[PDB]
């Protein structure tokens, strides 16, 4: 009786939450932004092509200076590229070939890499012996790592395939905080501009907004009908966008607690692998399984451009901190910079 | 040539990196990489010890071939999320315990897992090496408790030579892609010295088929 009574109480709370959300909604985003001028066709040409990877490229991250970038591929290689001269600054050989994520520290001193070995390795790029060396091996997870991001040079947050997020301490090497509450394994995370909060999307079709300091889940969003593979904050920090296997993107808001726009098309029936915003927050880059990338405008969900020129799945996608270039990786082992 | 001296030294370093990348990526394409799979209490542990917290990579060599097996057991996450990483392995090695028909039951779970992987969209052409292990005590587990407990449609004799063949044909079904891949099968025992020669012959056949598709005879 107690279990079913708690279940009915939970259902009543969910119903009152739904009623509050429905009472807050008074005018959809598509009704206020029907008067603003639309953007034309976004023609973007390929400027560079970083061709040194042999296997499938699974992750890429831009440096903060907007010139260097790290890429990870399952030939067991972590390559630091110079995007202006196309020069290979570094090539790091990994112990485990099965990687799924890589991060560039906002200082530029460290590179993180994680995969199917349940370990997040931290590599030092600025030693005095000349070569890059593995500094730390954060090993406390029980499922594969799907994302990792530096808060600073000493704190990193990692999402794993065991439904748990974890905030670590590079120096000591232990989990400072453990975020739990997801039921499906988490596939991506995204820090806010100010690093107080961060969202994470899981295979249970939910996106949870955690607070880094208190260690608690603040809000939960459910609008998708399948696994969520990509997530990214709006540049403002008061919204974000998710991309799932149901071939849609969705724009959730944090202060209204409900979604605002859905980016979908009839001709698109493939899942999204990656998503990223522009610098102004107007454009929305979404990489797909149909070998293409698409460019929406968030204020009115009509497709404004297409980035074609990859011969396999677009696995990773990143915008530079200046807003100058867009890097896209793929399973055909080529990175491409667009502008 | 619009490049300073430091820029030229940077380009020289980048190209010296490229040379090592090519050497490594051409040494990698000479190793055979097999993906181990199976259910609980199977023969995966045993076959690893006979041939040689996340993925366990085992390396060994046989007759000028270098194999690396990726035992991905214990990755208790959503398999539909990390299995495309293995699209492009030479062969799968699927272990099934023959004694687990009496102890739905374990054999039906193994058959469901085999049907799940053998028809995956990432393994539409990858060969499968079925290892039906633990036949030594399966030979005596059928003297009592006839096979009808697991398969109610069995009408043959309770002899080992026929029940084992019936199980083998029940497993070599479920292969809806009978034209792109082949299912190799072996009846091994805990004390068996020919378990690596069979996988060698199977991967030799897979290599020969890939070479026939490459040269153009297919």
């Amino acid at each position, epitope marked *: 009786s107690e279990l079913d009574q708690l279940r009915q109480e939970a259902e009543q709370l969910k119903n009152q939450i739904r009623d509050a959300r429905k009472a807050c909604a008074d005018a959809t985003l598509s009704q206020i932004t029907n008067n603003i001028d639309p953007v034309g066709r976004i023609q973007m040409r390929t400027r560079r092509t970083l061709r040194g990877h042999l296997a499938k490229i699974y992750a890429m991250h831009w440096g903060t200076d907007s*010139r*260097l970038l790290v890429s990870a591929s399952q030939d067991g290689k972590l390559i630091i590229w*110079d995007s202006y*001269t196309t*020069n290979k*600054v*570094h090539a790091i050989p990994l112990r485990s070939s099965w990687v799924m994520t890589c991060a560039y520290a906002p200082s530029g001193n460290y590179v993180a890499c994680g995969g199917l070995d349940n370990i997040c390795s931290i590599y030092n790029l600025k030693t*005095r*012996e*000349g*070569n890059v060396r593995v500094s730390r091996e954060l090993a406390g997870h029980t499922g594969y790592l799907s994302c990792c991001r530096f808060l600073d040079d000493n704190q990193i947050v990692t999402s794993s395939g065991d439904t748990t997020c974890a905030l670590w301490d590079i120096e000591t090497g232990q989990q400072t905080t453990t975020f739990t509450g997801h039921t499906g394994d988490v596939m991506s995370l995204s820090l806010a501009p100010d690093t107080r909060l961060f969202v994470s999307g899981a295979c249970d079709a939910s996106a949870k907004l955690w607070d880094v300091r208190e260690g608690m889940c603040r809000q939960t969003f459910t609008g998708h009908e399948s696994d969520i593979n990509a997530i990214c904050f709006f540049p403002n920090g008061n919204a974000f966008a998710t991309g799932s296997d149901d071939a849609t993107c969705r724009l959730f808001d944090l202060r209204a607690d409900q979604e605002l726009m859905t980016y979908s098309h009839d001709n698109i029936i493939c899942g999204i692998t990656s998503v990223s915003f522009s610098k102004s927050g107007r454009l929305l880059l979404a990489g797909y399984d149909d070998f293409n990338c698409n460019v929406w405008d968030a204020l009115k969900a009509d497709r404004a451009g297409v980035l074609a020129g990859h011969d396999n799945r677009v696995s990773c996608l990143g915008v530079t901190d200046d807003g100058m270039a867009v890097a896209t990786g793929s399973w055909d082992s080529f990175l491409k910079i667009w502008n | 040539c*619009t490049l*300073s*001296a*430091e*820029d*030229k*030294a*940077a380009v*020289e*370093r980048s190209k*010296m990196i490229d040379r090592n990348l090519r050497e490594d990526g051409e040494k990698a394409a000479r190793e055979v990489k097999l993906l181990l799979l199976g259910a609980g209490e199977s023969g995966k542990n045993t076959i690893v010890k006979q041939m040689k917290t996340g993925i366990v990579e085992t390396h060994f060599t046989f007759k000028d071939l270098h194999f690396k097996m990726f035992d991905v057991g214990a990755q208790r996450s959503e398999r539909k999320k990390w299995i495309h990483c293995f699209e492009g392995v030479t062969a799968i090695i699927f272990c099934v315990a023959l004694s687990d028909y009496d102890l739905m039951n374990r054999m039906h779970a193994s058959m469901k897992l085999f049907d799940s992987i053998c028809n995956n969209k990432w393994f539409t052409d990858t060969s499968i090496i079925l290892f039906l292990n633990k036949k030594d005590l399966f030979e005596e587990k059928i003297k009592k408790s006839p096979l009808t407990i697991c398969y109610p449609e069995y009408a043959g004799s309770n002899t080992y030579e026929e029940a084992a063949a019936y199980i083998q044909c029940q497993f070599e079904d479920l292969n809806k892609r009978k034209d792109t891949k082949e299912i190799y099968t072996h009846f091994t025992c805990s004390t068996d010295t020919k378990n690596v020669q069979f996988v060698f012959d199977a991967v030799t056949d897979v290599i020969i088929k890939n070479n026939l598709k490459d040269c153009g005879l297919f």
Partner: single-chain antibody
Amino acid sequence: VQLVESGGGLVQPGGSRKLSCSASGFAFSSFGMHWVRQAPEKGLEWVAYISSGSGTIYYADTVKGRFTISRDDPKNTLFLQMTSLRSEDTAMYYCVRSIYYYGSSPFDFWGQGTTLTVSSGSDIVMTQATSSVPVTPGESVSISCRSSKSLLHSNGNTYLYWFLQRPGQSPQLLIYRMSNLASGVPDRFSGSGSGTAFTLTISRLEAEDVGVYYCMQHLEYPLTFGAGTKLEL
């Protein structure tokens, strides 16, 4: 990280000698090496350079065809074979490592050097309009230099390095481009400049920063240091 040079000694003119330099404690194979020398009482001058993997070699045009620089990667030594030693090739020889990628620090570690004594046009000239500057601790100094042509490349860089040699030791990298402080160097030194005129400002001195401040360009070859500026008292 250390470099130990050996060889040296007394040689008669027209003879030959092989200077060795054993490296220890760093990835020798990924570093290019330079041989630089310093006369008994003069400044620094660049002698030879061998890149990483031995793919590029440069000489100073004062020793070209007479010296041979060669690196051994397995046995970490670096060799300089010298033949037909004239009377101008008498000096202390330093080995200096250098690595070149985007954002690196070339010339970051100088060896100890070995003494060699022998009995009996389009280059860039680095002009340091000073030879000695008297100063007391706590004050701020501004050493200055100027070049023959603009050291500012088209790619935005300005290939000007500021070194420092303390009495009885080897030079030390202070600034590794116009306004780029090296690692391990206190935050008192500050580089600045524009075009062909450059300045090194020290906010407050100490007892461990008096000595000869040199300069160097890396825009073209050969590498030309300026004449030192001595800070005493």
